[PDB]
């Protein structure tokens, strides 16, 4: 699904079809992130229902996200080169 | 899960160390501070509740809830039944008996009297309305926050809170 077909489905305007073609019908993934530090380094456990972000001692302010796996791999390598991307869920001007 | 009104307080370059709770030094954490905000963002003060206004206002809201659920048609435990679930049944039950057997006042009229008396920090404002004291040393030993204020007039506050205090 080349970049040019992406440009065409932008030319038509079907944003939902694109959000589909680049998610469900390929590689969806889920990541639990913190809200103070802003990194994908949350230690989570589900059938016990408990979370922990040891970099800030935070067991309350955590949010889950739906991203492709390739973005997870990308950001893990960028962190592996000491360049940190931080993701926040609310604007602040 | 259930939030409130306060956000922001964002992390900076430092970590503040005056963050622990101490009710003897007026440290109530970042939740019951001095200046709060309502459901719209307007600047509000803190509303601390002492015993008398506590019981009276609980009776008010829960009686308007009883008559309200009755379409428009009095006791502690029966009024705690208007709620839902069992947590408010037990907890609100022992809360109504608790705040019931210590009522320094049982009327909204003398509640208006002391409401004229009190109005000063809202916590210690509701604490002057809270603990019934004898002399001044009790008022400063129970509340060590009235030290560095230099504004007494507390003896007649005790003579009015005690002179008006209805008998139990």
């Amino acid at each position: 699904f080349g970049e040019m077909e992406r440009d065409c489905m932008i030319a038509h305007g079907a944003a939902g079809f694109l959000k589909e073609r680049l998610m469900e019908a390929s590689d969806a993934f889920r990541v639990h992130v913190c809200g103070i530090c802003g990194l994908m380094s949350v230690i989570a456990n589900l059938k016990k229902n408990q979370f922990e972000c040891r970099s800030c001692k935070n067991k309350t302010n955590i949010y889950q996200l739906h991203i492709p796996y390739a973005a997870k791999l990308l950001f893990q390598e960028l962190m592996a080169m000491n360049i940190a991307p931080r993701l926040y869920t609310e604007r602040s001007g | 899960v259930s939030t409130s009104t306060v956000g922001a307080r964002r992390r900076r370059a430092k970590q503040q160390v005056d963050d622990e709770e101490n009710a003897t030094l007026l440290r109530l954490g970042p939740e019951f501070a001095l200046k709060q905000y309502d459901h719209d963002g307007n600047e509000h003060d803190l509303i601390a509740l002492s015993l008398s206004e506590s019981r009276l206002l609980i009776r008010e809201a829960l009686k308007a809830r009883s008559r309200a659920r009755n379409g428009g048609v009095i006791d502690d435990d029966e009024l705690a039944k208007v709620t839902s679930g069992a947590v408010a049944n037990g907890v609100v039950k022992k809360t109504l008996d608790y705040l019931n057997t210590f009522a320094r006042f049982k009327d909204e009229e003398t509640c208006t009297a002391v409401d004229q008396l009190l109005h000063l920090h809202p916590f210690e404002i509701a604490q002057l309305s809270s603990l019934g004291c004898e002399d001044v040393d009790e008022a400063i030993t129970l509340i060590p926050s009235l030290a560095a204020k230099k504004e007494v007039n507390l003896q007649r506050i005790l003579d009015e809170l005690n002179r008006l205090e209805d008998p139990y």
Binding site: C8, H12, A28 | -
Partner: protein, 521 residues
């Protein structure tokens, strides 16, 4: 709905924040230490508590639940490690910036040379965006030849009154030259990373602002490497070769070599030290840390593999047409696709297509069981996955999947409200239809399906003008929708009749071609 249930409120990304990493941060987020170069335990399977496979890391086996988090191999995102160092080293991607900063400031007491008493400086303090700010600053502080121990009655800014050397670059090393005082002899020593660390660890915060950085995200002494992260083996997979042989992805061998060089750098400066044996091995460690993030370092030969091929440094997984940002995010690979050869047919209507029987019985469509269609889905579930018209998988609500192939006795199925049915592709579904390479926005159009035998697609010939297509052996592609929203968007936006007039030139595109034209004349 693929995912197990959690309890964290669902949101979305709004603002992305970039910034350098600090060492103590890496010491905090990491959950294990790296020490031992050998990969295996001691030939007894598993790993070596301390090696580059410690099961605290990434667990990619059928049964080993990730000991750190506890999940399987489908929920663990991996966990970072951290390797120590016995010496700080440069970062190959920042050298010219460290050069400029080692020019702008003092070389002792650590203070910004020019001050706001200079009108050019006094107006250079003000700019908003940092890059043009530091352009305006470095435009000036490249010529201040003394850390004035005074201000321009004597006022002392706090400077040390020392002269200033000149810094230059060769390969991966910075040279410092002191032209002493008309001209007395220069001395060109080597600014080792430890010195520059000690110097940058003194800059006041307001100069960390004036230099264009930020006190809580870009701190200059963070640019010089001290501790090192170790990515989880979800990033470094190990292939299985002839089933009984397995090599290691490059980053494993490279991290192992860096650790070898670390254990080498320890010993020499702990006892017998012939001086010219210390700086050489340390320079080798700098070389490893350099070729861990860049292979085409202009200036020095590429670090080869064991078999003599250049190593895939991290810098190359990303850039390029076949890396990450061109190859797995802008244009990834999709499902529910179809590729086959075209063929002409003059007995269709303008927006139809002819799907073979096999492509129809392979592709599918999820449908919701309601009250208006339960009968048709009873017939479809009865007709099985090997006869048209029939259905395939049946999906219940929690996440299970009944497969009507292996499920011998399927006559006992009763359909509850809310389930889904992956039926076949049938008549009148709107499918997207595409040819490479697409140029103007008319090369992707949604047609209506029509099932036909044989092995080729079908087109009405009047749609051979936007596709630039002809039946002399070409191929095209069919994409299938899934949910209802996207079907609505296809039928209401990407149809054929709504594309007859082109916005390129205010004139149509589809007309009469070939025999129909000659014989209508």
């Amino acid at each position: 709905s693929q995912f197990p249930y959690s309890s964290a409120p669902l949101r979305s990304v709004k603002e992305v924040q970039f910034g350098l990493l600090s060492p103590e941060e890496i010491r905090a987020i990491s959950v294990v230490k790296i020490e031992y170069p050998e990969i295996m335990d001691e030939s007894r399977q598993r790993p070596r508590e301390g090696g580059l496979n410690d099961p605290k890391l990434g667990s990619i086996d059928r049964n080993f639940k990730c000991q750190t988090c506890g999940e399987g191999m489908a929920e663990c995102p991996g966990h970072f490690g951290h390797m120590e160092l016995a010496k700080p080293v440069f970062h190959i991607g920042f050298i010219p910036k460290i050069k400029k900063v080692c020019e702008c400031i003092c070389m002792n007491c650590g203070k910004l040379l020019l001050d706001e008493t200079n009108p050019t400086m006094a107006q250079a303090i003000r700019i908003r965006d940092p890059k043009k700010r530091f352009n305006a600053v470095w435009q000036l502080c490249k010529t201040k030849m003394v850390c004035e121990a005074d201000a321009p009655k004597v006022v002392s800014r706090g400077g040390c009154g020392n002269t200033q050397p000149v810094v230059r670059k060769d390969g991966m090393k910075l040279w410092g030259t002191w032209k002493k005082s008309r001209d007395a002899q220069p001395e060109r020593k080597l600014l080792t990373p430890g010195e520059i660390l000690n110097v940058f660890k003194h800059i006041s915060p307001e100069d960390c602002f004036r230099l264009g950085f930020n006190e809580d995200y870009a701190r200059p002494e963070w640019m010089i490497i001290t501790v090192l992260p170790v990515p989880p083996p979800q990033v470094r997979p190990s292939i299985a070769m002839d089933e009984t042989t397995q090599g290691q992805d490059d980053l494993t061998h490279k991290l192992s070599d860096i650790l070898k060089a670390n254990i080498n750098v320890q010993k020499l400066e702990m006892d017998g030290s012939p001086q010219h044996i210390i700086n050489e091995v340390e320079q080798l460690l700098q070389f490893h840390v350099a070729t861990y993030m860049d292979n085409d370092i202009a200036g020095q030969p590429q670090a080869l593999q064991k078999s003599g091929r250049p190593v895939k440094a991290i810098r190359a997984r990303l850039k390029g047409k076949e890396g990450r940002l061109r190859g797995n995010l802008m244009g990834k690979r999709v499902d529910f696709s179809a590729r086959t050869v075209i063929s002409g047919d003059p007995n269709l209507e303008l927006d139809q297509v002819g799907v073979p029987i096999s492509i129809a019985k392979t592709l599918s469509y999820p449908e919701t069981v309601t009250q208006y269609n339960i009968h048709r889905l009873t017939e479809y579930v009865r007709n099985g996955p090997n006869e048209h018209p029939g259905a395939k998988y049946v999906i219940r609500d929690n996440g299970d999947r009944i497969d009507l192939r292996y499920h011998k006795r399927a006559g006992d199925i009763v359909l509850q409200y809310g389930w889904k049915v992956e039926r076949h592709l049938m008549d009148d579904d709107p499918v997207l239809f595409n040819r490479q390479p697409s140029l103007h926005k008319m090369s992707m159009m949604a047609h209506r399906v029509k099932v036909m035998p044989y092995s080729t697609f079908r087109l009405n010939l009047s749609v051979t003008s936007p596709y630039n297509a002809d039946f002399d052996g070409d191929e095209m592609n069919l994409h299938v929708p899934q949910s209802e929203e996207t079907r609505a968007e296809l039928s209401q936006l990407c149809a054929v009749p709504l594309q007859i007039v082109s916005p390129q030139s205010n004139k149509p595109v589809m007309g009469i071609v070939q025999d129909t034209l000659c014989g209508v004349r």
